[PDB]
Amino acid sequence: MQDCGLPPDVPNAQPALEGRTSFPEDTVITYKCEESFVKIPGEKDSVICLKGSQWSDIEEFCNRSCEVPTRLNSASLKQPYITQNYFPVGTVVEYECRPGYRREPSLSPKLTCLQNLKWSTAVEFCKKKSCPNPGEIRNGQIDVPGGILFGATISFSCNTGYKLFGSTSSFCLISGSSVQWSDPLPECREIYCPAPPQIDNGIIQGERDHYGYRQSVTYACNKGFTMIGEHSIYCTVNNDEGEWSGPPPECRGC
Template identity: 75%
Template sequence: MTVAQPSVPAALRLFGGLPGLLLLLLLCLPAVRGDCGLPPDVPNAQPALGNRTSFPEDAVVTYQCNESYVKIPGSKDSVICRQDGQWTDIEEFCNRSCNAPPRLSFAALAPPHISQNYFPVGTVIQYDCRPGYRRDPSLSRKVTCLQNLQWSTAPEFCKKRSCRNPGELLNGNINIPDGTLFGASITFSCNPGYKLYGETSSICLVSGNSVQWSDPLPECREIYCSAPPTINNGIIEGEREHYGYRQSVTYLCNKGFTMIGHNSIYCTVNGDEGEWSGPPPVCTGNQTPPAAQNPIMTNSANVHSPVSKATQSTPVSRTTKHSHETTPSKGSGAGSGTTVLLSGSWPGTQAGVQWRDRSSLQSRTPGHKRFFHFSYPGIWYYRPHVFHIDSFAWDASNHGLADIAKEELFLIS
């Protein structure tokens, strides 16, 4: 619409003919030639004058649309003061419009509408699906600016794409709380006794024109304990190279030793590291008896000395010698000797000591002369020995000495 300037006849009628026109000219005398008056009014818009009161030739005034109105794209929004003191023509350029189209999470404006900012009533725009979504052809992808300057409701015409099934995690678990659609996140965890190597989660993301998981499946590796602790005076039964979660070791004590503590421990997990459930047992031994003394060999001349000491009630040594005098077989060429059988220590004194004369026993071995034996009541630690004296030895074929030793040397407990 063009804003017209008032004509001369209309001005004459307005001011009462010629006298009125003269009055109008007098009022306009101060104006400078070519100076335009106030700019014309424009529907739904206001001129931006600032502090200006005069508008010389070529002065420009721009208009701004009123609230809830927008400038029609391509229309002129300013006027210019001409040389003849008149403003250039201007048409209505402000109109009502819907606001910017709604932003959809699953779709974006189609390219023709991306830069558009004027949406009068009846305007129709179109959307395209965003990456990670697929079009549902049964639903419209268009919205319209209604008479109330509101957009029509947009249906969810784009659906999320789905990532493939992540598969199975060996010795572990995959937690899928929200499905496998675009944007979904899954997490990974390992079974007890296993440690996770790799990413702990993965997200379904866009890949080209489709979607896929951001990270591959991790790996769950078995956690091993270090080698089991060894023990003194004992062994590990059935020891193996590796010990995994809940696998146990069993300990055995050597003969003569007693176990204190549990006989087995098992491999457990502390965080991501393996550790044993507790300390190993301890093998403790009973009081070790005194070590046997080396055998004492003596001449047959000393055989009778213990008799006189025993009959005189003198103290008896803690080391007692049991002597059996032997004579080698004729023709052996070896000298005479004495086989000595040594007992252990005796914790007593002469009280109760008995000297037994076994000389009346029939000798089972040629050359046997005499045999004496101490018998001690109470505690007696004894370890029998058979000794080889000189070049003469008693073996399995010479039963005489062995039989006598069995009869005469015994443990009194």
């Protein structure tokens, strides 16, 4: 009926004594690997106090191991590395691209545990996916300030004389399997000036169905009359309504 003394001394491991120094038979003491040490899977990490005041045998069960690889935005830890914590020197793990990222063939998606207990240099093996080419807007313009990769933003404009109809911008969002543009290409439609005013005792030289930006209309008085204002007027617009340069000339009189 004798108690057990102090547990055996295990290298790189510290036992949880619970402030005790003597333990009754059938006492199980568990060790915890020291800093930079991860318990070797399948190894005895504890001791029991047996008859004759004797502790059960126990061998070193800790190996200097890497910390769980740091999360990456481009890729994730494949299985089963994604659930492991024991990473002794020489341990290599494999990654798999996230969404929306794509594999850079020329580069390896593997990380190694260096002697110094750190993961080998990180390379861009998982490169950002690139949305389809914007295209082109008829009588409009697309602005790609920072490429068209996953996360980029592009804007749309309408050339002078045209009003934009649709989305004014678009984002390279991730959509399921691949990547796509948030909003669709708008349309740059041609602005039209309201029918040119008609004048008393005068007429419009060759009238047209519609008048667009920079388009003019020339007037002509009737035999025996005179103008009062500009002879012609042109279709203004600016941003983004169609407007005539000014009032129409004037004929008089009789």
